[PDB]
Ligand binder design. Sequence first.
Ligand SMILES: CC(=O)N[C@@H]1[C@@H](O)[C@H](O[C@@H]2O[C@H](CO)[C@@H](O)[C@H](O)[C@H]2NC(C)=O)[C@@H](CO)O[C@H]1O
Ligand code: CA
Length: 209
Amino acid sequence: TAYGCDITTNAVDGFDATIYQYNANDLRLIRDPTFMSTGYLGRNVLNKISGVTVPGFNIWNPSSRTATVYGVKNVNYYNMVLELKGYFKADVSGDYKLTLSHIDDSSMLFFGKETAFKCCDAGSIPLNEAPTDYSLFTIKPSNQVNSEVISATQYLEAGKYYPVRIVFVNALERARFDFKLTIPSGAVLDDFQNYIYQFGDLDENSCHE
Ligand SMILES: CC(=O)N[C@@H]1[C@@H](O)[C@H](O[C@@H]2O[C@H](CO)[C@@H](O)[C@H](O)[C@H]2NC(C)=O)[C@@H](CO)O[C@H]1O
Ligand SMILES: [Ca+2]
């Protein structure tokens, strides 16, 4: 019923990142759509990181299985599942494209229809969440280059919010997660600041007076 609210002061910038354990050298599960969509959720959580506006990275240190990822030291980039979630806000109306390029090892992207809101005095509550059907699934062929560039373009309405989830797996060595946004102007962005948000929780007893 409401796809927006006057008061959205509880919206804050950035993807929420969750990093999970993944067995080093496992080149099977990176190709398994059930694992990439749901199965990873059963693994031990290694890190939780908020406020991420630049989600892409390309990391390979032959001398260390850890690296600084999203400002956090000693992240086990060598073998991990990364889950990024948030609400994508269209600024202007038009076609927006999300592209995954040369991913090492694999990535699956989910991008939902517009979320409805419950509007409260202290901010807005998105009602819509866990888009469950993937749009894009890209996998680096074992031991050869990932030449794949895969994209999803859809029309977004100005000011509306669209839940998004991206799952990325590195099985071993290089972690290449190249995730870009093309906006209706044609500009290609690696920085999602002012497009990607979370909504802070609020006391639902005091939603209204
Ligand atoms: C059989 C073997 O060891 N081949 C080497 C490749 O593994 C290696 O590329 C690696 O492929 C993995 C599986 O697709 C990737 O997860 C991993 O990130 C990647 N490693 C790097 C450093 O890119 C290539 C790299 O040239 O060398 C082969 O000899
Ligand atoms: Ca890899």
